[PDB]
Design an enzyme around this catalytic site. Structure first.
Site, mmCIF file in Angstrom:
data_model
loop_
_atom_site.group_PDB
_atom_site.id
_atom_site.type_symbol
_atom_site.label_atom_id
_atom_site.label_comp_id
_atom_site.label_asym_id
_atom_site.label_seq_id
_atom_site.Cartn_x
_atom_site.Cartn_y
_atom_site.Cartn_z
ATOM 1 N N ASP A 1 41.054 62.371 49.964
ATOM 2 C CA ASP A 1 41.257 63.484 51.126
ATOM 3 C C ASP A 1 42.648 63.884 51.315
ATOM 4 O O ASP A 1 42.866 64.621 52.490
ATOM 5 C CB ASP A 1 40.337 63.171 52.117
ATOM 6 C CG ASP A 1 40.724 62.008 52.870
ATOM 7 O OD1 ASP A 1 40.089 61.566 53.965
ATOM 8 O OD2 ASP A 1 41.673 61.533 52.474
ATOM 9 N N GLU A 2 43.641 63.372 50.592
ATOM 10 C CA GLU A 2 45.161 63.725 51.033
ATOM 11 C C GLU A 2 45.809 63.699 49.748
ATOM 12 O O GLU A 2 45.809 62.999 48.909
ATOM 13 C CB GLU A 2 45.595 62.362 51.833
ATOM 14 C CG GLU A 2 44.906 61.979 53.131
ATOM 15 C CD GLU A 2 45.580 60.684 53.779
ATOM 16 O OE1 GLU A 2 45.837 59.720 52.803
ATOM 17 O OE2 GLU A 2 45.728 60.580 54.761
ATOM 18 N N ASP B 1 45.333 67.450 54.253
ATOM 19 C CA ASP B 1 44.613 66.346 54.658
ATOM 20 C C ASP B 1 43.370 66.969 55.095
ATOM 21 O O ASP B 1 43.125 68.013 55.695
ATOM 22 C CB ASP B 1 45.125 65.571 56.022
ATOM 23 C CG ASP B 1 44.076 64.338 56.174
ATOM 24 O OD1 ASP B 1 44.717 63.383 56.746
ATOM 25 O OD2 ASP B 1 42.875 64.422 56.227
#
Ligand SMILES: [Ca+2]
Length: 341
Positions: free
Chosen positions: A102-103, A7
DNA sequence: GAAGCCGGCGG
DNA sequence: CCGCCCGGCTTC
């Protein structure tokens, strides 16, 4: 199964600070606007220090941070930044699943040949690499499934390295707040407390059905598996990021001979931004009245542009029988469910 | 089928 | 806080 979940901490904030280093050590605020009013995308350490946070209207953010720097958001550059990182991860993983910009989830079971400690060190190695290579801090979770790996990551922010060991997993399942679970938000926890449930375990003493009457099978059952440690659900080679381009028309119309020459172009700026093969396409159309009429077909495998142009054409035309009175202001396409190679 | 509500989540 | 949002479950 060993999943490392990655993350990116306050990504947009971090990217800007990397691009313009003189923003560092000083309140920065990335902003997002509607179709209007503006809100906070993200905010950097010092902005957050003063109390700024996502969703906060820019007026409000200014009330508490006048010394802040308010920038507009630049999706494309953050996307370029994301993709560079996803590729780094990719080399590290058996399978990668890009959950969002973002993950990402990573199945590494093989990569470390089943050794969970080497799992953790790989996870360390990844953190250090992203920092060293891109100057960006991420938070990792290492656990024997997706859902746990996310949870322990979110438990470990900022810049964390969370850990659930197969050998220790039951103690974590024993102390988990029901509200800390993905899918369980502000409302559901409030209601699930009513029976006497704030720990995950609690459900196992409480009968099965009534819970569905508060959750819905697909989730009620998904809780039950987690409690029992029976949730597996593999890490798949797919990106979940939706790519979609629109184009406003010269005039509102219904003449397919007019809109096709705008559909085609909307797909080209998308079926090219693919990096894989979409299991989903959605033809999206805005009318004279801002209202939105979107249809899409799922594929067993993906769909290439080989089939695309007519999948989109009939998908428009099906929306041309679904609505028969109104004209089209704007035409869009959305490709998601991308399978990766 | 497909509109619409509800609820969760993130820009 | 609300969206060229989202998916999931209910309802005409
Ligand atoms: Ca995030």
């Amino acid at each position: 199964m060993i999943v490392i979940f990655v993350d990116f901490d306050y990504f947009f904030a971090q990217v800007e600070e990397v691009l313009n280093p003189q923003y560092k050590g000083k309140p920065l605020v990335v902003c997002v606007y509607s179709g209007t009013s503006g809100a906070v995308a993200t905010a950097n350490y010092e902005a957050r220090k003063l109390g700024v946070k996502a969703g906060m209207p820019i007026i409000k953010a200014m009330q508490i941070a006048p010394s802040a720097i308010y920038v507009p958001m630049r999706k494309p550059i953050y996307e370029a930044f994301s993709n560079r990182i996803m590729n780094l991860l990719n080399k590290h993983a058996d399978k990668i699943e890009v959950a969002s910009i973002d993950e990402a989830y990573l199945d590494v079971t093989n990569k470390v040949e089943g050794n969970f400690e080497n799992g953790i060190e790989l996870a360390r190695k990844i953190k250090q690499e992203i920092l060293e290579k891109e100057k960006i801090t991420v938070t990792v979770g290492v656990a024997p499934n997706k859902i746990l790996a996310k949870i322990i990551a979110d438990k470990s922010k900022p810049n964390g390295l969370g850990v659930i060991r197969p050998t220790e997993v039951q103690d974590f399942l024993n102390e988990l707040d029901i509200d800390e679970i993905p899918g369980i938000g502000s409302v559901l926890a409030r209601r699930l407390n009513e029976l006497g449930i704030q720990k995950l375990r609690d459900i196992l003493s409480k009968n099965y059905n009534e819970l569905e009457k508060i959750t819905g099978k697909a989730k009620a059952l998904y809780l039950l598996k987690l409690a029992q440690n029976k949730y597996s659900e593999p890490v798949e080679n797919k990106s979940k990021i939706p790519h979609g381009r629109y184009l406003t028309l010269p005039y509102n119309t219904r003449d397919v001979k007019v809109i096709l020459p705008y559909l085609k172009k909307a797909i080209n700026e998308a079926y090219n931004k693919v990096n894989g093969i979409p299991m989903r396409i959605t033809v999206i159309a805005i009318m004279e009245d801002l209202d939105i009429l979107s249809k899409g077909k799922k594929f067993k495998h993906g769909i290439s542009i080989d089939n695309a142009y007519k999948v989109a054409e009939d998908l428009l035309r099906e929306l041309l029988v679904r609505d028969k009175r109104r004209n089209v202001r704007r035409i869009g396409v959305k490709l998601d469910n991308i399978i990766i190679n």
